[PDB]
Design an enzyme around this catalytic site. Structure first.
Site, short mmCIF file in Angstrom:
data_model
loop_
_atom_site.label_atom_id
_atom_site.label_comp_id
_atom_site.label_asym_id
_atom_site.label_seq_id
_atom_site.Cartn_x
_atom_site.Cartn_y
_atom_site.Cartn_z
N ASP A 35 -0.04 15.63 -0.50
CA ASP A 35 0.03 14.61 -1.54
C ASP A 35 1.21 13.69 -1.26
O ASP A 35 2.35 14.02 -1.60
CB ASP A 35 0.16 15.26 -2.90
CG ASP A 35 0.23 14.26 -4.02
OD1 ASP A 35 -0.06 13.07 -3.78
OD2 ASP A 35 0.57 14.66 -5.15
N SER A 199 0.61 -4.98 -0.71
CA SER A 199 -0.53 -5.55 -0.02
C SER A 199 -0.53 -7.06 -0.20
O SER A 199 -0.07 -7.59 -1.22
CB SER A 199 -1.82 -4.95 -0.57
OG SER A 199 -2.96 -5.61 -0.04
#
Ligand SMILES: C#CCN(C)Cc1nc([C@]2(O)CN[C@@H](c3nc(-c4ccc(C(F)(F)F)cc4[N+](=O)[O-])no3)C2)cs1
Length: 330
Positions: A35, A199
């Site tokens: 994770d 992004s």
């Protein structure tokens, strides 16, 4: 040193991926959910409340000659879905795919919430976010990667998750045969303890690219791609019959639909998620309504590039003095 381990989807939907991890002496192999959005290595154990164990493999520290109680140390964690676990702490030898850390904090669960009990395939979590998020008290502990970093050939790990298929976690090296083209690296902020990056925008299907900054985290422990409601609406608007359902908990679409791809920007580069990766199948067995793999982050407070996005890429988690993230197509 290096390590390399295969990671395998737990079910036919890629709801999560499990990677075998050797703990203790002699080795006890547990299948852990790696994770990158959390920082605790915790396991089902011989200390877990018996009624909360349902088929998981347990770590038994009393059978490990290298286990030592970390005296007075406790841990307690809650995840984004409201699931939780807590317990005490041992140090022990932990190996992943040939890479060994001695004295790793292994957090033994005394209690786990129902969602963990109900998933017989996940024996615990191995956190790979920054150690500042580790929940051990009163002495915070380091992640497996943080402990291994100085010994690795290069201070990196990579995630190469498969689509309905196994993939690979590598530590300490970049497998140049595992991706196409070049890796584009992008800046990381560690201020919230995550692999947080920005992004450069998105496209839906064959559409043009929309340049817009999307701050989010690279999180292998989250199944889906969570993005701003504007972006998510623009995606689902292209699918006839798709709508957000409050009762189901997100966007659903007719199972008869073929989904458009979704592209996200990494600098000037682009990662294309095929439409099929966004199909999470019937909302319940036999239903013709299907659950979408792109969902709104509006209630979360952060955008999450979970498995739906990451499995379309070869992803470098660069833990150099200034951390960065790298993405390549594959
Ligand atoms: C709301 C809100 C705002 N914040 C808190 C969102 C965030 N969330 C995170 C993470 O904790 C980091 N990575 C993700 C993760 N999820 C799981 C997991 C594993 C197994 C199960 C199972 F019990 F079903 F088996 C469930 C989950 N689950 O859904 O939580 N493991 O890792 C989530 C960081 S910020």
């Amino acid at each position: 040193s290096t390590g390399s381990a295969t990671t395998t989807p737990i079910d036919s939907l890629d709801d999560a991926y499990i990677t075998p991890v050797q703990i203790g002496t002699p080795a006890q192999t547990l299948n852990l959910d790696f994770d990158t959005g959390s920082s605790d290595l915790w396991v089902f154990s011989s200390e877990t409340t018996a009624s909360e164990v349902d088929g998981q493999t347990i770590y038994t520290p009393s059978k490990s000659t290298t286990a030592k109680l970390l005296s007075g140390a406790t841990w307690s964690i809650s995840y984004g879905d409201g699931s939780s676990s807590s317990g005490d702490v041992y140090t022990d030898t932990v190996s992943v795919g040939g890479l060994t850390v001695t004295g790793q904090a292994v957090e033994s669960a005394k209690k786990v919430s129902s969602s963990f009990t109900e998933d017989s395939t996940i024996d615990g979590l191995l956190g790979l976010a920054f150690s500042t998020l580790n929940t051990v008290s009163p002495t915070q502990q380091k992640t497996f990667f943080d402990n291994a970093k100085a010994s690795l050939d290069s201070p990196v790990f990579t995630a190469d998750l498969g689509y309905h298929a196994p993939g690979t976690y590598n530590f300490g090296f970049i497998d140049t045969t595992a991706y196409t083209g070049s890796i584009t690296y992008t800046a990381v902020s560690t201020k919230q303890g995550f692999w947080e990056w920005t992004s450069t925008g998105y496209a839906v299907g064959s559409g043009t690219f929309k340049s817009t900054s999307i701050d989010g985290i690279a999180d292998t422990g989250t199944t889906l791609l969570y993005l701003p409601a504007t972006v998510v609406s623009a995606y689902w608007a292209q699918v006839s019959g798709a709508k957000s359902s409050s009762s189901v908990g997100g966007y659903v679409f007719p199972c008869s639909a073929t989904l458009p791809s979704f592209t996200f920007g990494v600098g000037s580069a682009r990662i294309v998620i095929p439409g099929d990766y966004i199909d999470f199948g019937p909302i319940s067995t036999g239903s013709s309504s299907c659950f979408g793999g792109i969902q709104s982050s509006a209630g979360i407070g952060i955008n999450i590039f979970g498995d739906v996005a990451l499995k379309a890429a070869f992803v470098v988690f660069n833990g150099a003095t200034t951390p960065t993230l790298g993405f390549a197509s594959k």
